[PDB]
């Protein structure tokens, strides 16, 4: 019965530690893949922002 602290808990924080390291916007290749074709395709998702 470890309070908060644990090997699994420490590592799960490390993965979140590395996430906030060097924040950058993911720049997709806009030049490629025939844009305006992309607009024609379906939603292909069930996403809900917040």
């Amino acid at each position: 019965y470890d309070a908060l602290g644990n090997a699994v808990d420490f590592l799960d924080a490390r993965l979140h530690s590395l996430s906030n390291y060097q924040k950058r916007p993911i720049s997709i290749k806009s030049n490629i893949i025939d844009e305006e074709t992309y607009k024609k395709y379906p939603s292909l998702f069930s996403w809900d922002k917040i």
Binding site: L11, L18, I28, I33
Partner: protein, 489 residues
């Protein structure tokens, strides 16, 4: 919140399944990801790959039979985002390193009890290799040739060396259970062969880092490692034997002496094109033009020689008896005063140091032969021979042991080092001016422990073992169950 990310990957797994990955719709799908706020930030991206992996391992759980359809889809997603994404100058490097950090991060989180299995992670790494191995086919021709290609060519060498770095994080020493699974990945058909064949030995740097990790572990779940270690070196001995020849210095250092079989294979390695004469047949190596060639060495031993670079080289030039005293005093210092070991090998004679010296002398002796008509290099009074001769006589028993050991190791394929060090061993054995039984016993002991083990027996020792009887000066050695070998051959 995390359930949301799960639903997305649930959309990816279902799509690619029942669809050929090559279809460009998959490239549009990832283009749809950035549309939403899921991949909008890197903090969420690394979080997406995070949860996507923990789901695959969970998906692997509860599976009676080989459910990889979930994790294999991820492995392709990693690569599909490495190529289809527009990267800045240094950002491409940080990207691949980031994901690898996550994968090994979850592995550790999994290794910590919270029903851990080592097969799915191995499958993931394997898919990444197979995938990338397909992309890099023929100078990355498969891609658009937009000269984004050019960015990937420079990334090819940086991909494996960094990947090897993250592989080192899960070395057998770290995870005993993943040990066997670690070796199989090292000897992967898409990893080992090409890194050895990378342009101008750029990958050899990190290949060593992995093998050393393997050797240090050998110094039980060890049997699986050793059994796997052997089939690698043999595989390399056939594929790229030069790797065993050049890096032998940095390789012999971290290899325990208990392993005599593994020792020979490394030294028994010969260049691919070359062919050698029968060693057991009876002289005059001057007739042989192959041994005149200088053996390449990837790592110069002068670096690990440190401060003794000056007094040794000054001694190699002129044999100053006063300069001999300081060199010895330095060795005795590193042995007794400082550099104190622990347990077995307490007050160790620095095998790395001694080997570095003996090897350094041989190299400088080789350059001295390529120049200046070569007549001088072989002599009893030659400086290159004088140094090795004096260090023995004035060196202690354990000190003498390492010198002779190092000398024998350099006797490999038909090169000038083998030619020279043989003349050293041969002359020294027949050399007077010693007060001698002790020395000859060490000459024999360190040499004898290179033939008794199963073949392949190294070329160098075979010849030196032949000319010894052919020289006619046998069992007459008074020290010689040692006589049991005489009847053997």
């Amino acid at each position: 919140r995390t359930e949301k990310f799960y639903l997305v990957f649930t959309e990816w797994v279902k799509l690619l399944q029942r669809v050929e990955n090559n279809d460009v719709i998959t490239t549009v799908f990832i283009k749809q990801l950035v549309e939403k706020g899921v991949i909008s930030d890197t903090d969420n991206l690394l979080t997406f790959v995070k949860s996507s992996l923990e789901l695959s391992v969970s998906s692997f759980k509860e599976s009676d039979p080989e459910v990889f359809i979930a994790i294999d889809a991820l492995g392709s997603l990693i690569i599909k985002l490495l190529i289809l994404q527009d990267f800045k100058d240094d950002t491409r490097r940080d990207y691949i390193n980031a994901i690898f950090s996550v994968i090994v991060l979850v592995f550790a989180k999994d290794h910590s009890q919270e029903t851990f299995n080592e097969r799915p992670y191995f499958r993931l790494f394997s898919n990444i290799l197979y995938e990338w191995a397909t992309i890099r086919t023929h100078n990355f021709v498969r891609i658009s040739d937009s000269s984004t290609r050019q960015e990937l060519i420079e990334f090819d060498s940086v991909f494996y060396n960094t990947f090897s770095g993250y592989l080192h994080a899960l070395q057998p020493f770290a995870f005993p259970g993943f040990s066997f699974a670690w070796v199989t990945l090292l000897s992967h058909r898409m990893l080992l062969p090409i890194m050895l064949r990378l342009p101008n030995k750029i990958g050899w740097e990190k290949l060593m880092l992995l093998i050393i990790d393997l050797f240090k572990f050998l110094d039980d779940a060890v049997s699986v490692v050793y059994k796997g270690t052997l089939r690698i070196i043999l595989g390399i001995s056939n594929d790229m034997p030069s790797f065993l020849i050049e890096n032998h210095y940095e390789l012999m250092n971290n290899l325990p002496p208990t392993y005599f079989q593994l020792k020979n294979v490394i030294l028994s390695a010969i260049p691919k094109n070359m062919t050698v004469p029968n060693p057991y047949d009876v002289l005059n190596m001057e007739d042989i033009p192959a041994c005149k060639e200088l053996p390449e060495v990837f790592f110069d031993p002068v670096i690990d020689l440190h401060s003794l670079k000056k007094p040794v080289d000054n001694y190699l030039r002129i044999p100053s008896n006063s300069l001999l005293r300081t060199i010895l005093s330095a060795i005795y210092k590193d042995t007794y005063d400082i550099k104190k070991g622990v347990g077995y090998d307490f007050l160790s004679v620095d095998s790395k140091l001694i080997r570095a010296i003996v090897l350094h002398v041989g190299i400088e002796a080789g350059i001295e032969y390529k120049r200046t008509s070569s007549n001088a290099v072989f002599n009893t009074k030659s400086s290159y021979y004088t140094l090795l001769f004096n260090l023995i006589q004035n060196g202690s028993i354990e000190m003498k042991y390492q010198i002779i050991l190092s000398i024998v190791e350099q006797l490999r394929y038909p090169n000038i080092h083998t030619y020279w060090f043989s003349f050293v061993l041969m002359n020294m054995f027949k050399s007077d001016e010693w007060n001698k039984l002790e020395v000859q016993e060490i000459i024999l002991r360190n040499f004898l422990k290179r033939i008794i083990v199963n073949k392949p027996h190294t070329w160098g020792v075979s010849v030196f073992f032949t000319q010894l009887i052919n020289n006619n000066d046998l069992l007459d050695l008074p020290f010689v169950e040692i006589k049991l070998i005489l009847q053997q051959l």
